[PDB]
Amino acid sequence: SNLEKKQKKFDQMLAEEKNISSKYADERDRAEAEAREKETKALSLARA
Amino acid sequence: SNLEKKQKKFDQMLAEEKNISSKYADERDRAEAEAREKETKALSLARA
Amino acid sequence: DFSEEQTAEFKEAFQLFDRTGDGKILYSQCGDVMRALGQNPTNAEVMKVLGNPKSDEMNLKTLKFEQFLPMMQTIAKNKDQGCFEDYVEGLRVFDKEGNGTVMGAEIRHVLVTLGEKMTEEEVEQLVAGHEDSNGCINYEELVRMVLSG
């Protein structure tokens, strides 16, 4: 029964953790992007 | 039966692990940016 | 990056850690020197630095001073910065009577219950630096001392 109460609170954690993990994916994709443009512009100006 | 429902929750664990795989792709992208930054450091020494 | 003063500091550390050849740098050596040169966070940065959990060859763990410089920057972006309020609350929870009557045994116990542990001579060495009596400190003096480097 305490595993069942763990089950319901774990389902709420399922929802919230899906949301937060999607947020982590989004923010890390934005970071990887902005980094990519940073090194592209740096290397382009450097090679020129 | 409720443990089989827990196994469905573990399928949602698999879903969040797919999200973590997205973070893993971000990890390769940031590692590539890191290596390109090392190249940029050597390049900047050459510029100096 | 800053001026060439930090590059000069890294160069003099490079010639300082010149054992078994000045040119090559061991990741253990670079980690030690970067930690001591004012960067506390070193625990889990091995994966964030190498990109490979490979930690099998002690003799040849390749690193060069050239790529060493951006490594210092991407570490020094200060990925984590804690402050003593969390530390003192954790210790006062760990504390028993609110004053620290005899703290010597239980601190050793709590440090040997952690999986990621490396040294015992440091555990016996911590007695130096005002930590002399039978756990006389209520941890404020030792927190102040450790937060001075």
Place this chain on the structure above:
Amino acid sequence: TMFGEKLNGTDPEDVIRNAFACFDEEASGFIHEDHLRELLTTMGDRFTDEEVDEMYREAPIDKKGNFNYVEFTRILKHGAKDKDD
């Protein structure tokens, strides 16, 4: 002056004695041969252990590996000499 050009980068016995007291706390002058070579040849200004061996084939080292320094300091200075004519 032709002796003057022969003296440079050296100091009297006091500083060498103090340094030898510093490096090992016991100050007994038990400079073990492995410890001696590790502390001398390895770190600092890199130089060859083969030329370091002149400190071994000539200077009298104490037995069982340890190397006394007070007699070494005296012979380095004018206080003592290995032999006489």
Place this chain on the structure above:
Amino acid sequence: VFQEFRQRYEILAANAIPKGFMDGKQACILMIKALELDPNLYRIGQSKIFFRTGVLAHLEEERDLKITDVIIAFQAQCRGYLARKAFAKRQQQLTAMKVIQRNCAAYLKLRNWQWWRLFTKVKPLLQVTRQEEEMQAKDEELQRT
């Protein structure tokens, strides 16, 4: 023991429960409802509460789970401090010792036979220094008297 019970268990979950006020049975009841465990797993008392075998097997590891971040951070600070101290002491000692002493050793060993003969006519130096040495030693033995 009641005090031991607080020091061992309430350290896990004390926040979100009113605190400060002290009472023998009442504080124990508040802690029990904070744990919301089975009354069948223990029996109340006036001095000590007697539990069964399996209660301790699911409460200790929560402390391990929670205090983990704090101990990681604290040991990181300790390792940093140790590294700084040892590194600085090391480096200063090696600089002083090795620089000075290798310089002196090289200077003497090159000149050990670069001018060996002129270093061997230093025999009369002991004979001529005897007056000054005797006067000095007289001074220090006078102060030791």
Place this chain on the structure above:
Amino acid sequence: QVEEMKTQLEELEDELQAAEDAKLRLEVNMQAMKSQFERDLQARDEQNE
């Protein structure tokens, strides 16, 4: 002029070498005598013990 400037070269280099070396080794002696003083401290400590 070149004679006098290299005269200051030799003079200042010799004086700086001597002074800095004596200073660093004197701080080494500072630590050493502090260590002997603290050994005397533990000697009085064991007498009290």
Place this chain on the structure above:
Amino acid sequence: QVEEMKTQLEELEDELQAAEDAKLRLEVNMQAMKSQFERDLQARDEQNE
């Protein structure tokens, strides 16, 4: 060469003020030695107390 040795002379002057800085460090070191002398005296008086 005239301005070359002028620049070298200016550099020598700069290292000259570096030499007086080393001298100033000499005096601060000596006063530090005496200072820790009375600190040790006070410490031994404390153990006597």
